[PDB]
């Protein structure tokens, strides 16, 4: 029709059908057929070994440290508490200027914690301070939407996810957005860095996940398998795969090199959304926190559920596996954190 | 060794007792979320009560009111940040007739939210003077936008102000019942809606919110003891 809008709509559909054909072309088998001869992991019934209390409101984020002992949790009571999970003692309690917090990270060097929320600001806190007490060091501004997730690469570069449908790589010292990631239509809710820092994925409310090159700022692969907002994302320990959970009550495993979904973890008695996902050290176990007050542990190869964590009194808002694989922690809207193994 | 354990134990003690002092402050603050479309009188209402935040006291009772205006227009994922607020103050313009259908749809989406099942809403029907202006002028009639208004009967419980035209009484009680028809359709005693007729010069909004919060907590305690 000559009108350049109709020519872009046509080339759009042409690309979507070339992509659907190139995707079904390599789907010679399914993951279930591949894993039908494996032995099941058996029933895994882990129990709550510790419980970390103190928070006055609903918790939204946690991240284990590299030492596999400490972890930080952010609640909307205006606090960011750092715990020594071995002795259940609290190491720090950082009050926040804005009480609306949605994410928190723990630097791999254990030197810094980060957090942000509806203030559209990413706040960095230096655990190694010279005057005595942890206080604000940096504060990253620029987003027109809230802050949904953030994870350190090193002590100076950090990537953020925001509700302005963009992600950004920051230089903590200069405070400049060294790299911008645009292309999502809806709010980006979660990001996950690969184990080798070279790439990272992001799950947005457009029911899509995107793989981003940190240093180059380009989107390499876009996956569309979920029917609704992506709420959680996490890399396989190998680095070439990741799992996502969405509001459509389903978990999906995508591979980077095959560029499509491999397997879907769901049950027809599960209707409520998914809030957090994380793999074990070997990637055989996938832990997910649900709206149904439970946390389900899946066998990442057989789609069988191998246990439940019915210990929270409200929606499980976050979870995380230790770097040594010794235990998993779960944060919920009941104002309690629980350690399981 | 064991000394670092005693230092960690007294660090935890100082932490838990700071959080103990913080708990008493947080327990007595009544968080109120202000929501509503633009071109409403919400921001003027906040200006009158003396940006993002507001802190005000009525009779030794603290309130902390927040409007989410620095975000985008997708009110979906951040709504779950207000599941524990004491009340939502929904502000509506009573003189706009099509803007008002948007307000009804937003009120319906707030009232049936999965995460706001227990959040009561205070409905402010602002700009009643302009509504009276438009009704007495008779150039834009409600029946063209709400044909139900033709068959609407002034309620027998209506309390018109001295000199108020029966047309204005029927118009503002008609808007009152389109919002009560939504609030009573699925509230089922878990939460309630308290309508109020307001104008831009009215200064009794702060008292009305205090009375409504009193009623909200009264009806929460009554339901907690299985009376109401």
């Amino acid at each position: 029709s000559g009108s350049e809008l109709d020519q872009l709509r046509q080339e759009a559909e042409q690309l979507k059908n070339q992509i659907r054909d190139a995707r079904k072309a390599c789907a010679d088998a399914t993951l279930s057929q591949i894993t039908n001869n494996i032995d099941p992991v058996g029933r895994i019934q882990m129990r709550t070994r510790r419980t970390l209390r103190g928070h006055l409101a609903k918790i939204y984020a946690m991240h284990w440290g590299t030492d596999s002992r400490l972890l930080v949790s952010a609640s909307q009571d205006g606090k960011l508490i750092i715990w020594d999970s071995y002795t259940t003692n609290k190491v720090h309690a950082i009050p926040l200027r804005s009480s609306w917090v949605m994410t928190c990270a723990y630097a791999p060097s254990g030197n810094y914690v980060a957090c942000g929320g509806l203030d559209n600001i990413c706040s960095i806190y230096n655990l190694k301070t010279r005057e005595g007490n942890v206080r604000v060091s940096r504060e990253l501004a620029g987003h027109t939407g809230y802050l949904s997730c953030c994870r350190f690469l090193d002590d100076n570069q950090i990537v953020t996810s925001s509700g302005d449908t963009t992600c950004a790589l920051w230089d903590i010292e200069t405070g400049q957005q060294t790299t911008t990631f645009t292309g999502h239509t809806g709010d980006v809710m979660s990001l996950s860095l690969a184990p080798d820092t070279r790439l990272f994925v992001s799950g947005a409310c457009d029911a899509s996940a995107k793989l981003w090159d940190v240093r180059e700022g380009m989107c390499r692969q876009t996956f569309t398998g979920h029917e609704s907002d992506i709420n959680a994302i996490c890399f396989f320990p190998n680095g070439n795969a990741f799992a996502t959970g969405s509001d459509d009550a389903t978990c999906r495993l995508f591979d980077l090199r095959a560029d499509q979904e491999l397997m879907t973890y769901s049950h027809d008695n599960i209707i409520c959304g998914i809030t957090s996902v994380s793999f074990s050290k070997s990637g055989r176990l996938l832990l997910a926190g649900y709206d149904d007050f439970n946390c389900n542990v899946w066998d990442a190869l057989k789609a069988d559920r191998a246990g439940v964590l019915a210990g929270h009194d409200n929606r499980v808002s976050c979870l995380g596996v230790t770097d040594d694989g010794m235990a998993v922690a779960t944060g919920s809207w009941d104002s309690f954190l629980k350690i399981w193994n | 060794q064991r000394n670092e354990e005693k230092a960690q134990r007294e660090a935890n003690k100082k932490i838990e007792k700071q959080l103990q002092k913080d708990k008493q402050v947080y327990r007595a603050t009544h968080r109120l979320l202000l929501l509503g479309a633009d071109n409403s009188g919400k921001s003027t209402i906040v200006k009158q009560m003396r940006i993002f935040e507001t802190k005000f006291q009525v009779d030794k009772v603290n309130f902390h009111m927040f409007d989410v205006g620095g975000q985008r227009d997708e009110r979906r994922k951040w709504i779950q940040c207000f599941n524990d607020v004491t009340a939502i103050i929904f502000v509506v313009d009573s003189s706009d007739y099509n803007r008002l259908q948007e307000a009804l749809n937003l009120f319906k989406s707030i009232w049936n939210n999965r995460w706001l099942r227990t959040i009561s809403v205070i409905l402010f029907l602002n700009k009643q003077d302009l509504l009276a202006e438009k009704v007495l002028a008779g150039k834009s009639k409600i029946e063209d936008y709400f044909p139900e208004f033709a068959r609407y009967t002034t309620p027998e419980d209506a309390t018109p102000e001295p000199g108020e035209d029966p047309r204005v009484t029927r118009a503002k009680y008609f808007i009152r019942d389109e919002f009560l028809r939504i609030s009573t359709a699925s509230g089922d005693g878990r939460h309630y809606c308290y309508p109020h007729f307001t104008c831009a010069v009215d200064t009794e909004n702060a008292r009305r919110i205090f009375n409504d919060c009193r009623d909200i907590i009264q009806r929460m305690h009554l339901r907690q003891y299985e009376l109401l």
Partner: nanobody
Amino acid sequence: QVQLQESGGGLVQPGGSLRLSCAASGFTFSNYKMNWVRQAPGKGLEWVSDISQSGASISYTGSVKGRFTISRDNAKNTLYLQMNSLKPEDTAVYYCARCPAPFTRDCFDVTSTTYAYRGQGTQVTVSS
């Protein structure tokens, strides 16, 4: 991938009856509340009709009440909007929108700038 395509609509004299069909793919149509909204030139998005999960409950705005009808079919995965006795003010681009979450009576889909689950839309013009 969520996909919504509107079809139908065009130039027609006032008083004509016309049916728009929204085809949906990428989700289980039975689990989502649906809306038909429109954007007239010179004004923003406004909601027109609403249909529930099973079609038991429907709603319309007062502007188009008594003429517009909304009907969904879960079996063939398609929404429909019928207009009768069109008026000169009914000239707008019609969007079929999906309410964001399954198993919920909530909808936040009148967003003017960007919504992730609305179709391209069709032009419906009423003129003489």
